[PDB]
């Protein structure tokens, strides 16, 4: 049915319908405008009028302008054809390559999996990255808080994750830019092309891109994480995959929700956040989980407002996180890449019960010896000298050449299997390689290459 605009106040538009009203969350299509303008129903105001949030600018709108009820929430292209493409919150291509020709479309508002669909199986999603797999492993269906600003190799880590998960497991990735800076959205796209995770010439792309740029209205930036989620849900629920979902930034998801709540006249809660802060977060996060079909695992870049970890935004987000990856400038300036702080990064599945007994012991041994090395930095005996040289070789063996940084450097990038990582750090703790030099452990893959780097350079 066709309604009529009765109010326009910024990105808030009221629409009157003569017959049956569109349910809350339904997408409405504004008639007679150059590009596509979607309005999402937020409230039934009474007297046949609904209040909506606009997905694009509202300038030029006239009272009485015709509006079409689509019959459903925002529906976007889902399938293999999303891989390598960039779409917006309403599923339109924004890479100037034409339609995204999927054989299915899906609603962006979808209930989180039910209790009966839950998997109790705790499984490590092997990334093939030594720092991560050993000390702060990712859990299938889990959420990982990615910390650190820029210049700490964030994007290269992201691209290698996409590369590795597709290579090792056979699962695809989805990148949701929530409040994406248009300049940085362009950079990321072309960097992904260079690394090979996006291929413009064939169907081998490993990521689907979903962008909600900063200059878009609150409604668009609030819903774009859901759009990305919906693309990921196809690969899990229709193709049985272990999918990766990147959300850059989770705070900007919260911020956009606060702005939408403000625009709808809802009274702000503590610190100015929306009263629906926790439910806004929960209805989104709970869709990221392990089910019987597969799993969506999510890496979420975290901004901490005012560096206050007790701020409602990070505090509410932390409730949903299972692990952290802390990218550090101090680790970067030491030349160790990835620049992951091996002591600050933690994981809930670092447990002798979930991961192997062999996994837990070695990782606890690596943690202890790195902390003890920092203790001995202030100040040695034969036992202390042995723990110092062991730890310095451990610091270097945590570094890794990436497959994504192969054309830039020329150095062969490495994907290291889990058991190869565990036994590598196990052979250093035992002092089996304290017979061999130190810098042979810097920027290598499996331990067999560190032995060969000592065999060649002797």
């Amino acid at each position: 049915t066709t309604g009529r605009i009765v109010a326009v106040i910024g990105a808030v538009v009221d629409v009157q319908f003569d017959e049956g009203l569109p349910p809350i969350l339904n997408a409405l299509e504004v008639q007679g405008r150059e590009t596509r303008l979607v309005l999402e129903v937020a409230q039934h105001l009474g007297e046949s009028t609904v209040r909506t949030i606009a997905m694009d600018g509202t300038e030029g709108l006239v009272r009485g302008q015709k509006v079409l009820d689509s019959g459903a929430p925002i529906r976007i292209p889902v399938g293999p054809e999303t891989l390598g493409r960039i779409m917006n919150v309403i599923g339109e291509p924004i890479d100037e390559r034409g339609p995204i020709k999927t054989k299915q479309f899906a609603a962006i508002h979808a209930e989180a999996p039910e209790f009966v669909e839950m998997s109790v199986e705790q499984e490590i999603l092997v990334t093939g990255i030594k720092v991560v797999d050993l000390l702060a492993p990712y859990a299938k269906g889990g959420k990982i808080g990615l910390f650190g600003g820029a210049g700490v190799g964030k994007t290269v880590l992201i691209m290698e994750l996409i590369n590795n998960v597709a290579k090792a497991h056979g699962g695809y990735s989805v990148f949701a830019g929530v409040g994406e800076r248009t300049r940085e959205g362009n950079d990321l796209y072309h960097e992904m092309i260079e690394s090979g995770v996006i291929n413009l010439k064939d169907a081998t792309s490993k990521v689907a891109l979903v962008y909600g740029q900063m200059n878009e209205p609150p409604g668009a930036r609030a819903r774009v994480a859901l759009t990305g989620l919906t693309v990921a849900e196809y690969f899990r629920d229709q193709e049985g995959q272990d999918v990766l979902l990147f959300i850059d930034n989770i705070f900007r998801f919260t911020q956009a929700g606060s702005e939408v709540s403000a625009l709808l006249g809802r009274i702000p809660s503590a610190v100015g956040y929306q009263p629906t802060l926790a439910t806004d977060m929960g209805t989104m996060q709970e869709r990221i989980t392990t089910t019987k079909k597969g799993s969506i695992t999510s890496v979420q870049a975290i901004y901490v407002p005012a560096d206050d970890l007790t701020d409602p935004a990070p505090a509410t987000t932390f409730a949903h996180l299972d692990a952290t990856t802390v990218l550090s400038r101090a680790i970067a300036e030491l030349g160790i890449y990835p620049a992951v702080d091996p002591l600050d990064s933690t994981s809930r599945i670092m447990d002798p019960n979930i991961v192997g007994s062999e996994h837990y012991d070695v990782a606890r041994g690596v943690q202890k010896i790195l902390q003890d090395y920092k203790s001995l930095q202030d100040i040695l005996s034969e036992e202390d000298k042995l723990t110092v040289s062991r730890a310095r070789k451990i610091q270097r063996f945590l570094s890794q050449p990436f497959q994504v940084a192969e054309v830039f450097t020329g150095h062969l990038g490495k994907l290291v299997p889990l058991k190869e990582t565990i036994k590598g750090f196990q052979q250093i703790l035992a002092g089996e390689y304290d017979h061999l030099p130190e810098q042979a452990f810097y920027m290598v893959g499996p331990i067999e290459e560190a032995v060969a780097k000592a065999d060649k350079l002797a």
Partner: protein, 480 residues
């Protein structure tokens, strides 16, 4: 058409539906929406009824028909719920089919007054040494579990549930403890993993799980504790004993604050409404010990509160402390050091539990209480050298793994060794190893003494002298 028994939605979109009609609806009556959602008549006004919706409001539209149920908001109660996972309304979410419960209780029923009650006298055994010895809990008591995120809060509750298996396998209904775990605001995966754990431990059969998770509408999270409490009161008022865990009340308060701000009620501290204390007070007052004329039953509550950075002086933490009968405080710094359970002894309190401790435990734990209080200021001259030596070894006995809660007599045996001075010559780093080796010895060899302590609930002179010889002869036998 029937404006007395039915109404039409006027507006919806702030968690509240305004409904025209329903002229005969009661305050706090459950109503039913066309979509199948339920709601509570909150606001009776001259021209409309304000309805709180127990589900997603996307499912309600202007013009939808709303029907009276004639019933003040209630839930199914009874033994049929044991072994089941239900939502806040008491509907099965575990796919195990219908729940047979015929009786129902109002979720908002006021707690028993002064006269129906009697002082808590019966032990509610957690099987956790630190708790049962130093922070004892009685049946009828409310004992807050409080601490920062990931400090071991839920683990206290889970081990307590698992512990009851030994009584519940018996035939004496008075000694049994039926359990209710209320999940509020949690991840669905977390709850699923929880039931799996309980099932593996054969504890699920005497447990009801009520779940309103992170993606459930705020009014469902608000409701969940009250629903679970009514399921608990069924046992309390049937002359039996129930234990309820609210995990957690911080998230419930957040859910209520959402509802309250959307209702445009004036906020105060941290934007919480002025009735946020009452939200928790009316709930926890319902955990009670009944006198014999009322059947002698009880409901024990373990509410959970999450602190930010160890700050117990904040609004919601202080509110709940001012309600419960003491707290178990879990500390990040202790958890970080590997002290598990991460219980701060000095800061933890049981206001009413000492009368609900067996004499057997009252004996060895009172002297441990003294020896730890004399250790919390000395932590070298010989006068303070003994106080430090004893305190570190006693602290080692307070360490405990998960999922293996201990019989009270087994707890009394391990604490006996440290208090009487059978660990003094042994090094602190080897106490944990000694304890497990000593426990398997007394279980395998001396069941007669452990059985007698369990039955009598006391260590007599015969039991004391007999136990003296066993620990002496094992200490000489224990080498490395």
């Amino acid at each position: 058409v029937d404006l007395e028994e039915t109404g039409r939605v006027l507006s919806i979109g702030d968690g509240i539906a305004r409904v025209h009609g329903l002229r005969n609806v009661q305050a706090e009556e459950m109503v039913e929406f066309s979509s199948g959602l339920k709601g509570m008549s909150l606001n009776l006004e001259p021209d409309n009824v304000g309805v709180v919706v127990f589900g997603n409001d996307k499912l309600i539209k202007e013009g939808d028909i709303v029907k009276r149920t004639g019933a003040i908001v209630d839930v199914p109660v009874g033994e049929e719920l044991l072994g089941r996972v239900v939502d806040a309304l008491g509907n099965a979410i575990d796919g195990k089919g219908p729940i047979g419960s015929k009786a129902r209780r109002r979720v908002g029923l006021k707690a028993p007054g002064i006269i129906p009650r009697i002082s808590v006298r019966e032990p509610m055994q957690t099987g956790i040494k630190a708790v049962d010895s130093l922070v004892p809990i009685g049946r009828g008591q409310r004992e807050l579990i409080i601490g920062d995120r990931q400090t071991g809060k839920t683990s206290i509750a889970i081990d307590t549930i698992i512990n009851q298996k030994r009584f519940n396998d018996g035939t004496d209904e008075k000694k049994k403890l039926y359990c209710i775990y209320v999940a509020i605001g949690q991840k669905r995966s977390t709850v699923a993993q929880l039931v799996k754990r309980l099932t593996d431990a054969d504890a699920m059969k005497y447990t009801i799980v009520v779940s309103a998770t992170a993606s459930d509408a705020a009014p469902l999270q608000y409701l969940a504790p009250y629903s679970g409490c009514s399921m608990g009161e069924y046992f309390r008022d049937n002359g039996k004993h129930a234990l309820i865990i609210y995990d957690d009340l911080s998230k419930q308060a957040v859910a209520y604050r959402q509802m309250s701000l959307l209702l445009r009620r004036p906020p105060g501290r941290e934007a919480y409404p002025g009735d946020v204390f009452y939200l928790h007070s009316r709930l926890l007052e319902r955990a009670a010990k009944m006198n014999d004329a009322f059947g002698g039953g009880s409901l024990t509550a373990l509410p959970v509160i999450e602190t930010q950075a160890g700050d117990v002086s904040a609004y919601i933490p202080t509110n709940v402390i001012s309600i419960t009968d003491g707290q178990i405080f879990l500390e990040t710094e202790l958890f970080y050091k590997g002290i598990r359970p991460a219980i701060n002894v000095g800061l933890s309190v049981s206001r009413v539990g000492s009368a609900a401790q067996t004499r057997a435990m009252k004996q060895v734990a009172g002297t441990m209480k003294l020896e730890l209080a004399q250790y919390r200021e000395v932590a070298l001259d010989a006068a303070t050298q003994q106080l430090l030596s004893r305190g570190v070894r006693l602290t080692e006995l307070l360490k405990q793994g998960q999922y293996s809660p201990m019989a009270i007599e087994e707890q009394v045996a391990v604490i006996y060794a440290g208090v009487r001075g059978y660990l003094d010559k042994l090094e602190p780093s080897k106490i944990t190893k000694f304890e497990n080796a000593f426990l398997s010895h007394v279980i395998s060899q001396h069941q007669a003494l452990l059985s007698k302590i369990r039955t009598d609930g006391k260590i007599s002179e015969e039991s004391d002298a007999k136990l003296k010889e066993i620990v002496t002869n094992f200490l000489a036998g224990f080498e490395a």
